[PDB]
Amino acid sequence: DLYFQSHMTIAVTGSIATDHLMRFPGRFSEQLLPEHLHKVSLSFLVDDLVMHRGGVAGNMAFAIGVLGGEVALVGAAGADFADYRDWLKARGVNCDHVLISETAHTARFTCTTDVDMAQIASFYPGAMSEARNIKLADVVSAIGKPELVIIGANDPEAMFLHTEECRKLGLAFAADPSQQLARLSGEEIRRLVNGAAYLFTNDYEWDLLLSKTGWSEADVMAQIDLRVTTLGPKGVDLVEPDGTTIHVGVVPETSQTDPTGVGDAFRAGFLTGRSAGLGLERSAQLGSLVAVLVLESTGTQEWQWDYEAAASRLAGAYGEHAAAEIVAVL
Amino acid sequence: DLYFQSHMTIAVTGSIATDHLMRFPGRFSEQLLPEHLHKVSLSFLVDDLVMHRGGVAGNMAFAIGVLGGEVALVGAAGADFADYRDWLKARGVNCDHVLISETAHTARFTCTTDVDMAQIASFYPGAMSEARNIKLADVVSAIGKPELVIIGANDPEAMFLHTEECRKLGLAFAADPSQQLARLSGEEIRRLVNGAAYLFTNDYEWDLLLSKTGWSEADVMAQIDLRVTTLGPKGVDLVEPDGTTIHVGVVPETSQTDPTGVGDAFRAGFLTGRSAGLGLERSAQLGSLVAVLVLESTGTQEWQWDYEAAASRLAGAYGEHAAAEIVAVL
Ligand SMILES: NC[C@H]1O[C@@H](n2cnc3c(N)ncnc32)[C@H](O)[C@@H]1O
Ligand SMILES: NC[C@H]1O[C@@H](n2cnc3c(N)ncnc32)[C@H](O)[C@@H]1O
């Protein structure tokens, strides 16, 4: 692809939503009877309901912007998006390539979190379904070739069309299907993975992807450059095709407030570090910090970047060398 | 209790809500990995979202009214309830004892149904929490002693207060905790059961109640007059303390459209038949018909009673004797 380069820009594709977050003051697992998983009938009486900006692409773009990166949000929203746009522009996110639906509502995420941070949610797409009409070729024409396109959870068809466009245009992409692994068939999952510079999942999603694709881990590692699997309280594994695994533990949290968007924040921080020339371990350390700041705040985009508190906390979790390197590049 | 009798009235206590019903075009069970039930992270992309009148008490009162029974709805709603009241009054439901909140919103049920009719939902109480301020003594003062008080899923505290009021007032009650078994502790469940004329659950809920109370089946049967356990496609079991079990299979359905409120409809039809002097088997046959009509319609209260179609279908499922008896009493 002989077209001109964007200056260090990440293009973030995926959902743009309003998040309705609720808390269940019990444990989902206690109500989940193995004997009955074939047909659950479950309704959780919640304590709390709060509304926040969301969507995986909105969350990740926000985080890249807060960290000072160049980032373009690519997704479909409803006519209400003008206000969300101002919020994202306040952190330096380029929103020029958001498709604004003429008729449909911005997507709605309705999520219940229990006391163990397990989550069970619905996602009503609305305008998200129009993302299949977005042409990444037009984005590239306007801003240049991105360093990386993130293929986040989106309209299912769009997830594939965007991946195919990256392949034919020679753009590096990150396969980041997260929540849609539940909706996507095995065939639909398998066609998103080949050639990915990164595959991101949490541990549950990794097992789910293997289960639904019928692939072994070796089948996956043969076709990607790096697997990144987050492990809840055990941190993150970064695994290369030759098996070399780098592990990074979490940043100790002060509160476990709301896990929504913690993975999105990790991905944003990690990819920011990678764009900034940091290695795998240093990038995942930075990612782990943004993750914990999202875990300690309600909502996905309700956290702040204070450079000296960040430096101090990185040093406290990983040593002074890591902290110096990381804050230095920001 | 020497106070005067209401003419054949059932008092229905429980939730009054707006239901947001969505469909997931896959299978929850396929996404439920036994290995991971300790901490699920699940978000279902849905195809569909429709809004309907609901709440277990609204559903059951509606159904009793449609069948011609005398019924009083007892629960808490928001100021929007005026419109829902007109709908229920159109079927002969007495709504005089609904508590209308001055500040809170009518409760919200957000529910996703998969292709196997499994369901996963949140329930935001809003005004429902004010049901704990309702005194059944005042209801009884106004209308007389009901034949039966149904203790449906409600504000948790209200569920217990209502049961205690029935006990001290000598009113027959039906323990019908259904969905709240997930929210209620073992102690909170156990204090709802003793002295119940009927205990209603579906099969999943029966196992859940046994699991969380630590009780054996014998522990439960010693303290209730009848256990009624619905069995999905296998119908319903009606079990007496001495072990005598009467089983009734389903009415064959033409479509499996939406299972929300099927149990509510069964309960309403069964209790209507019992109030009308029908035996256990005939009552559960009538209940099974109302259940299937709700299964074949979207929403909980969007079905109709056509006496000749009802007679024909009852005869088709249970024989002409049952149909003649049942329609005769209506
Ligand atoms: N990672 C957290 C973010 O994920 C969004 N989300 C949840 N389920 C989704 C889904 N099934 N499809 C697209 N986006 C989804 C949701 O909007 C939230 O802000
Ligand atoms: N049986 C179906 C009815 O149950 C209502 N419902 C669902 N979950 C509930 C819950 N947790 N508490 C009270 N009512 C609930 C819901 O409103 C629906 O109309």
PDB file of C-alpha atoms in Angstrom, chain A residues 22-49 109-110 112 114 116-125 128 154-156 179-184 202-205 207-208 211-212, chain B residues 22-49 109-110 112 114 116-125 128 154-156 179-184 202-205 207-208 211-212:
ATOM      1  CA  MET A  22     -26.644  -1.886  37.403  1.00  0.00           C
ATOM      2  CA  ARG A  23     -25.416  -3.810  40.441  1.00  0.00           C
ATOM      3  CA  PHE A  24     -26.795  -7.092  41.787  1.00  0.00           C
ATOM      4  CA  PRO A  25     -25.887  -7.407  45.529  1.00  0.00           C
ATOM      5  CA  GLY A  26     -25.481 -11.149  45.303  1.00  0.00           C
ATOM      6  CA  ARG A  27     -23.473 -13.699  43.334  1.00  0.00           C
ATOM      7  CA  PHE A  28     -24.481 -14.878  39.887  1.00  0.00           C
ATOM      8  CA  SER A  29     -22.600 -18.148  40.426  1.00  0.00           C
ATOM      9  CA  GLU A  30     -24.728 -19.063  43.449  1.00  0.00           C
ATOM     10  CA  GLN A  31     -27.842 -18.780  41.258  1.00  0.00           C
ATOM     11  CA  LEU A  32     -26.194 -20.643  38.372  1.00  0.00           C
ATOM     12  CA  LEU A  33     -26.945 -24.311  38.947  1.00  0.00           C
ATOM     13  CA  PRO A  34     -24.718 -26.508  36.715  1.00  0.00           C
ATOM     14  CA  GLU A  35     -27.575 -28.985  36.523  1.00  0.00           C
ATOM     15  CA  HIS A  36     -29.695 -26.280  34.861  1.00  0.00           C
ATOM     16  CA  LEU A  37     -27.322 -24.476  32.505  1.00  0.00           C
ATOM     17  CA  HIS A  38     -29.156 -25.989  29.518  1.00  0.00           C
ATOM     18  CA  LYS A  39     -32.011 -23.564  30.102  1.00  0.00           C
ATOM     19  CA  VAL A  40     -31.543 -20.808  32.647  1.00  0.00           C
ATOM     20  CA  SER A  41     -34.417 -18.644  33.868  1.00  0.00           C
ATOM     21  CA  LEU A  42     -32.750 -15.831  35.778  1.00  0.00           C
ATOM     22  CA  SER A  43     -33.871 -12.338  36.767  1.00  0.00           C
ATOM     23  CA  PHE A  44     -31.727 -10.212  39.072  1.00  0.00           C
ATOM     24  CA  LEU A  45     -33.244  -7.514  41.269  1.00  0.00           C
ATOM     25  CA  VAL A  46     -30.717  -4.674  41.183  1.00  0.00           C
ATOM     26  CA  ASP A  47     -29.834  -1.921  43.688  1.00  0.00           C
ATOM     27  CA  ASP A  48     -28.582   0.713  41.370  1.00  0.00           C
ATOM     28  CA  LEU A  49     -28.795   2.030  37.814  1.00  0.00           C
ATOM     29  CA  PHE A 109     -25.885  -1.634  26.691  1.00  0.00           C
ATOM     30  CA  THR A 110     -27.828  -2.853  29.755  1.00  0.00           C
ATOM     31  CA  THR A 112     -25.707  -6.129  35.605  1.00  0.00           C
ATOM     32  CA  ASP A 114     -22.594  -8.933  40.768  1.00  0.00           C
ATOM     33  CA  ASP A 116     -17.668 -10.967  42.276  1.00  0.00           C
ATOM     34  CA  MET A 117     -17.475  -8.618  39.226  1.00  0.00           C
ATOM     35  CA  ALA A 118     -19.201 -11.153  37.003  1.00  0.00           C
ATOM     36  CA  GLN A 119     -21.308  -9.458  34.313  1.00  0.00           C
ATOM     37  CA  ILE A 120     -24.415 -10.315  32.338  1.00  0.00           C
ATOM     38  CA  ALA A 121     -25.693  -7.871  29.730  1.00  0.00           C
ATOM     39  CA  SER A 122     -27.794  -7.228  26.656  1.00  0.00           C
ATOM     40  CA  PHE A 123     -26.722  -5.032  23.739  1.00  0.00           C
ATOM     41  CA  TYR A 124     -29.349  -3.438  21.505  1.00  0.00           C
ATOM     42  CA  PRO A 125     -27.582  -2.335  18.307  1.00  0.00           C
ATOM     43  CA  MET A 128     -24.642   0.262  15.245  1.00  0.00           C
ATOM     44  CA  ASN A 154     -19.402  -4.144  16.308  1.00  0.00           C
ATOM     45  CA  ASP A 155     -22.207  -4.984  13.930  1.00  0.00           C
ATOM     46  CA  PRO A 156     -21.219  -8.576  13.077  1.00  0.00           C
ATOM     47  CA  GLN A 179     -18.300  -9.589  23.702  1.00  0.00           C
ATOM     48  CA  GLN A 180     -19.511 -10.520  20.279  1.00  0.00           C
ATOM     49  CA  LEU A 181     -17.929 -13.931  20.582  1.00  0.00           C
ATOM     50  CA  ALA A 182     -21.300 -14.891  22.060  1.00  0.00           C
ATOM     51  CA  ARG A 183     -23.211 -13.786  18.958  1.00  0.00           C
ATOM     52  CA  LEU A 184     -20.732 -14.832  16.243  1.00  0.00           C
ATOM     53  CA  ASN A 202     -10.020 -12.139  28.322  1.00  0.00           C
ATOM     54  CA  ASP A 203      -9.545 -15.706  29.559  1.00  0.00           C
ATOM     55  CA  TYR A 204     -13.224 -16.643  29.363  1.00  0.00           C
ATOM     56  CA  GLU A 205     -13.400 -15.332  25.803  1.00  0.00           C
ATOM     57  CA  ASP A 207     -11.824 -20.519  25.911  1.00  0.00           C
ATOM     58  CA  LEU A 208     -15.069 -19.513  24.195  1.00  0.00           C
ATOM     59  CA  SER A 211     -14.709 -23.838  21.816  1.00  0.00           C
ATOM     60  CA  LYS A 212     -16.728 -22.256  19.003  1.00  0.00           C
TER      61      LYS A 212
ATOM     62  CA  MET B  22     -35.471  -8.768  23.647  1.00  0.00           C
ATOM     63  CA  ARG B  23     -34.459 -11.857  21.679  1.00  0.00           C
ATOM     64  CA  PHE B  24     -30.962 -13.319  21.347  1.00  0.00           C
ATOM     65  CA  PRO B  25     -30.779 -15.445  18.126  1.00  0.00           C
ATOM     66  CA  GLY B  26     -28.404 -17.927  19.682  1.00  0.00           C
ATOM     67  CA  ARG B  27     -28.241 -20.238  22.689  1.00  0.00           C
ATOM     68  CA  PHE B  28     -27.238 -19.047  26.133  1.00  0.00           C
ATOM     69  CA  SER B  29     -26.088 -22.564  27.044  1.00  0.00           C
ATOM     70  CA  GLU B  30     -23.522 -22.630  24.230  1.00  0.00           C
ATOM     71  CA  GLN B  31     -21.945 -19.472  25.686  1.00  0.00           C
ATOM     72  CA  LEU B  32     -22.170 -20.794  29.253  1.00  0.00           C
ATOM     73  CA  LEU B  33     -18.940 -22.676  29.863  1.00  0.00           C
ATOM     74  CA  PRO B  34     -19.219 -24.839  33.027  1.00  0.00           C
ATOM     75  CA  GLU B  35     -15.530 -24.225  33.616  1.00  0.00           C
ATOM     76  CA  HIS B  36     -16.285 -20.494  33.903  1.00  0.00           C
ATOM     77  CA  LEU B  37     -19.553 -20.295  35.832  1.00  0.00           C
ATOM     78  CA  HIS B  38     -17.679 -18.872  38.838  1.00  0.00           C
ATOM     79  CA  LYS B  39     -17.389 -15.554  37.027  1.00  0.00           C
ATOM     80  CA  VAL B  40     -19.294 -15.092  33.795  1.00  0.00           C
ATOM     81  CA  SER B  41     -18.708 -12.137  31.481  1.00  0.00           C
ATOM     82  CA  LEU B  42     -21.565 -12.283  29.001  1.00  0.00           C
ATOM     83  CA  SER B  43     -23.158  -9.700  26.715  1.00  0.00           C
ATOM     84  CA  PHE B  44     -25.788 -10.741  24.178  1.00  0.00           C
ATOM     85  CA  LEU B  45     -26.356  -8.770  20.984  1.00  0.00           C
ATOM     86  CA  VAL B  46     -30.124  -8.832  20.476  1.00  0.00           C
ATOM     87  CA  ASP B  47     -32.314  -8.656  17.346  1.00  0.00           C
ATOM     88  CA  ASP B  48     -35.411  -7.163  18.782  1.00  0.00           C
ATOM     89  CA  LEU B  49     -36.756  -4.991  21.593  1.00  0.00           C
ATOM     90  CA  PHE B 109     -37.808  -5.484  33.604  1.00  0.00           C
ATOM     91  CA  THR B 110     -35.145  -5.881  30.884  1.00  0.00           C
ATOM     92  CA  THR B 112     -33.339 -11.395  26.913  1.00  0.00           C
ATOM     93  CA  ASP B 114     -32.651 -17.099  23.567  1.00  0.00           C
ATOM     94  CA  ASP B 116     -34.308 -22.384  23.622  1.00  0.00           C
ATOM     95  CA  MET B 117     -36.592 -20.052  25.672  1.00  0.00           C
ATOM     96  CA  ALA B 118     -33.941 -19.588  28.337  1.00  0.00           C
ATOM     97  CA  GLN B 119     -34.137 -16.126  29.926  1.00  0.00           C
ATOM     98  CA  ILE B 120     -31.714 -13.739  31.574  1.00  0.00           C
ATOM     99  CA  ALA B 121     -32.999 -10.446  32.957  1.00  0.00           C
ATOM    100  CA  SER B 122     -32.503  -7.493  35.263  1.00  0.00           C
ATOM    101  CA  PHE B 123     -35.255  -5.931  37.377  1.00  0.00           C
ATOM    102  CA  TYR B 124     -34.956  -2.314  38.498  1.00  0.00           C
ATOM    103  CA  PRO B 125     -37.437  -1.816  41.354  1.00  0.00           C
ATOM    104  CA  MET B 128     -41.768  -1.300  43.751  1.00  0.00           C
ATOM    105  CA  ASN B 154     -42.005  -8.096  45.080  1.00  0.00           C
ATOM    106  CA  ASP B 155     -39.860  -5.777  47.142  1.00  0.00           C
ATOM    107  CA  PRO B 156     -38.085  -8.370  49.316  1.00  0.00           C
ATOM    108  CA  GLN B 179     -37.713 -14.724  40.265  1.00  0.00           C
ATOM    109  CA  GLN B 180     -36.747 -13.245  43.571  1.00  0.00           C
ATOM    110  CA  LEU B 181     -35.329 -16.552  44.703  1.00  0.00           C
ATOM    111  CA  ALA B 182     -32.122 -15.222  43.146  1.00  0.00           C
ATOM    112  CA  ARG B 183     -32.092 -12.117  45.349  1.00  0.00           C
ATOM    113  CA  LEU B 184     -33.442 -13.599  48.604  1.00  0.00           C
ATOM    114  CA  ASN B 202     -40.802 -23.795  38.127  1.00  0.00           C
ATOM    115  CA  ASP B 203     -38.376 -26.723  38.278  1.00  0.00           C
ATOM    116  CA  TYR B 204     -35.234 -24.584  38.217  1.00  0.00           C
ATOM    117  CA  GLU B 205     -36.601 -22.442  41.039  1.00  0.00           C
ATOM    118  CA  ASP B 207     -33.933 -26.754  42.960  1.00  0.00           C
ATOM    119  CA  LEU B 208     -32.713 -23.227  43.708  1.00  0.00           C
ATOM    120  CA  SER B 211     -30.219 -25.291  47.451  1.00  0.00           C
ATOM    121  CA  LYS B 212     -30.414 -21.918  49.206  1.00  0.00           C
TER     122      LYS B 212
END
